[PDB]
């Protein structure tokens, strides 16, 4: 751990200053982190750790009550956090930080800690704010679960969801966050370059390889230390001032996806299939590298011996993205207003494609890959786009008919787009790997 505690103090203060105005008016907040799960990394409590500390702290409880932050954790972790206590000790602080150390040879001490924090919460009032979808396992949780359940039943706690409130508190990216998002996005560009190269070779060398094995080839390159060394200059250059670039901090947002031949699925649920790579028509590729917990996403369509209608529809896909980012994706507008405006545009330029279009044009991106309270569809009329928002702008058309094949085709484009904090400045593409038709088309 090398923790910026000024950033910690800063984000804790922002939270504490917003949370009583969260829906339902919670008197206190409670985050409980079991064991970490690499296969389930975007739970709110984990996102909270990441925003506060840039690390996930397992077997750790954090409570926000009026005038006090309580952290129940190991001795080891309490030493990592110790420098924080002093930082709140000063009279520009409405809040004190307390570290309550667990002792695993002392089970009765440990139970006491839980009883004591629940008493503090009860004092704050009856409404307790917890991320309702959080679901952690392991030994710490098994200690916690019965104690908390008994507390709710005996103390008449009104336990309410705070997911939307948390989503709002950390939505806007500060300069350092924007820079980590830039690094993460450059990593996406690098892996997509490799992906395109590898996909072209697999077609050229007639490789026996499925869509899934090819995307797995790309996925595992994150472990190739030679490959990582190649990436480092371009990525490290983008790191924020005073921050050194670190390999340990580079990860996947999700497993890479390659689609070809028979099956195109434009839903976020899509996975690479076990079908042999199909070296003709449209190839959809998605990469999304994470850096220092900050997610990105890029999606490209490659055209292998396209028909004229395919190539034409690809040109429209480019013109559509340019319209959205330049003219539609504006601060102050809701996801619903943005989406309706997109449909309207397609209606006045290529009306017949409307039924084939995706039901969203992406979501807010950040420490969470896909914020469910900020999807760019018609169901969200309750968020406004803000300066400092980063989006995964991702859309496509599926089930497009190819006059030349029994296989329908599909086209898909995704980029990570930053909205600057400055009013005078336009949306900035963080992913910049080519999407020019002549550079993603291949003839065999």
């Amino acid at each position: 751990l090398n923790i910026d505690f000024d950033v910690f103090k800063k984000r804790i203060e922002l939270l504490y200053s917003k949370y009583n105005e969260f829906e339902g008016s919670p008197n206190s907040l409670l985050f409980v982190l079991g064991s970490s799960n690499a296969e389930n990394p975007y739970q709110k409590t984990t996102i909270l750790h990441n925003w506060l500390l840039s690390y996930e702290f397992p077997a750790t409880l954090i409570a926000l009550v009026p005038g006090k932050v309580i952290i129940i954790t190991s001795s080891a972790k309490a030493k990592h956090l110790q420098k924080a206590i002093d930082l709140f000790k000063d009279p520009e602080s409405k809040i004190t930080l307390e570290l309550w150390q667990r002792n695993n040879k002392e089970p009765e001490l440990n139970k006491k800690l839980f009883d004591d924090v629940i008493a503090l919460i009860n004092s704050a009032g009856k409404t307790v704010g917890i991320p309702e979808k959080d679901s952690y396992q392991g030994k710490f949780m098994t200690e916690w679960n019965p104690v908390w359940e008994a507390a709710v039943k005996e103390n008449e706690f009104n336990v309410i969801d705070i997911s939307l409130g948390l989503s709002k508190v950390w939505e806007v990216k500060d300069v350092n966050e924007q820079a980590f998002l830039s690094v993460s996005s450059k990593g996406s560009d690098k892996f997509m370059d490799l992906l395109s190269n590898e996909m072209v070779r697999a077609v050229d060398e007639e490789l026996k390889i499925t869509n899934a094995k090819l995307s797995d080839k790309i996925e595992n390159k994150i472990d190739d230390v030679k490959f990582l060394k190649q990436l480092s200059p371009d990525l490290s250059a983008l790191c924020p001032p005073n921050y050194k670039f670190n390999f340990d901090l580079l990860d996947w947002t999700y497993s890479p996806i390659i689609q070809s031949g028979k099956k195109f699925d434009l839903r976020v649920s899509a996975r690479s299939t076990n079908d042999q790579l199909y070296g003709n028509g449209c190839i959809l590729a998605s990469c999304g590298i994470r850096y220092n917990n900050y997610c990105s996403n890029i999606t490209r369509t490659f055209l292998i011996d396209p028909s004229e209608e395919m190539a034409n529809n690809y040109d429209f896909l480019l013109t559509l993205q340019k319209e959205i980012v330049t003219n539609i994706l504006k601060p102050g507008r809701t996801p619903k207003e943005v989406y309706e405006s997109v449909i309207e545009y397609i209606e006045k330029t290529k009306p017949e494609l409307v039924p084939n279009f995706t039901k969203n044009i992406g979501s807010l991106i950040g420490l969470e890959f896909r914020d469910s309270n900020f999807i760019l569809n018609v169901k969200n009329d309750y968020r406004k786009i803000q300066r400092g928002d980063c989006f995964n702008i991702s859309f496509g058309f599926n089930n497009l008919k190819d006059s030349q094949s029994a296989n329908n085709y599909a086209l898909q484009l995704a980029d990570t787009v930053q909205i600057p904090l400055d009013e005078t400045e336009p949306p900035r593409f963080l992913t910049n790997y080519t999407k020019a038709k002549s550079q993603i088309s291949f003839y065999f």
Side-chain angles (χ1 to χ4, degrees), residues 88-244:
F88 293 87
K89 285 256 240 0
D90 82 85
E92 289 231 282
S93 62
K94 227 100 155 87
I95 338 164
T96 69
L97 190 254
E98 287 179 14
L99 268 20
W100 291 9
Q101 306 184 23
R102 283 169 54 85
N103 182 346
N104 287 26
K105 259 268 78 64
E106 285 302 332
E108 192 61 52
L109 147 55
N110 284 177
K111 180 202 159 62
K112 180 93 193 92
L113 295 185
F114 286 154
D115 293 323
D116 289 356
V117 85
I118 294 167
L120 290 180
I121 288 161
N122 189 53
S123 285
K126 298 308 193 185
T127 300
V128 189
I130 85 165
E132 89 128 73
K133 305 87 189 172
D134 281 0
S135 175
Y136 297 95
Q137 285 61 67
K139 147 160 65 199
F140 180 86
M141 296 306 293
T142 61
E143 283 174 38
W144 175 249
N145 288 162
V147 175
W148 180 245
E149 289 161 6
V152 174
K153 278 168 162 172
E154 282 165 27
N155 290 342
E156 320 210 282
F157 285 155
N158 175 211
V159 184
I160 63 169
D161 186 24
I162 65 166
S163 304
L164 176 67
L166 290 170
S167 171
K168 295 181 186 172
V169 184
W170 60 51
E171 175 188 329
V172 175
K173 303 283 170 293
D174 64 42
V175 281
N176 295 325
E177 293 185 297
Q178 294 186 32
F180 290 132
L181 285 165
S182 298
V183 167
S184 137
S185 287
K186 178 52 75 149
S188 288
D189 283 352
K190 288 278 192 199
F191 275 89
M192 184 59 76
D193 183 75
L194 172 70
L195 194 157
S196 174
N197 294 343
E198 285 296 313
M199 186 276 287
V200 170
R201 191 180 61 92
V203 178
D204 185 57
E205 290 176 357
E206 306 188 55
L207 297 183
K208 179 177 183 182
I209 194 159
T210 59
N211 303 125
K213 184 82 178 215
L214 179 62
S215 57
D216 228 38
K217 182 201 284 284
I218 295 326
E219 195 170 348
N220 298 320
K221 276 271 167 161
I222 207 150
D223 297 317
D224 175 3
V225 151
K226 176 77 176 69
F227 191 73
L228 297 191
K229 274 178 173 55
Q230 299 161 229
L231 302 194
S232 299
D234 279 10
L235 265 71
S236 64
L238 291 175
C239 277
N242 206 35
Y243 281 90
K244 298 162 68 292

Side-chain angles (χ1 to χ4, degrees), residues 294-310:
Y294 288 90
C295 294
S296 59
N297 185 58
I298 192 187
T299 289
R300 294 285 181 272
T301 301
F302 307 98
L303 303 172
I304 309 177
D305 296 298
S307 66
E308 214 32 54
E309 91 270 333
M310 274 183 47

Side-chain angles (χ1 to χ4, degrees), residues 67-97:
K68 275 200 191 158
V69 175
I70 297 83
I71 300 188
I72 303 186
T73 196
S74 69
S75 310
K77 291 181 206 310
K79 277 111 222 79
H80 294 319
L81 298 174
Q82 222 281 166
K83 299 296 207 312
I85 296 163
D86 266 294
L87 226 51
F88 293 87
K89 285 256 240 0
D90 82 85
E92 289 231 282
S93 62
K94 227 100 155 87
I95 338 164
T96 69
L97 190 254

Side-chain angles (χ1 to χ4, degrees), residues 259-270 282 284 301 313 317 346 352-360 395-402 407-413:
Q259 309 196 95
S260 68
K262 279 195 251 214
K263 170 152 150 77
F264 301 109
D265 183 343
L266 302 196
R267 295 170 284 166
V268 289
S269 81
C282 299
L284 311 186
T301 301
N313 284 150
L317 189 81
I346 304 174
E352 77 286 357
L353 291 179
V354 172
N356 306 82
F357 201 49
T358 45
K359 302 297 178 79
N360 61 254
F395 57 84
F397 299 90
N398 206 355
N399 301 327
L400 297 167
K401 299 194 164 50
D402 189 15
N407 298 310
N408 282 222
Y409 68 96
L411 308 169
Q412 196 181 28
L413 202 62

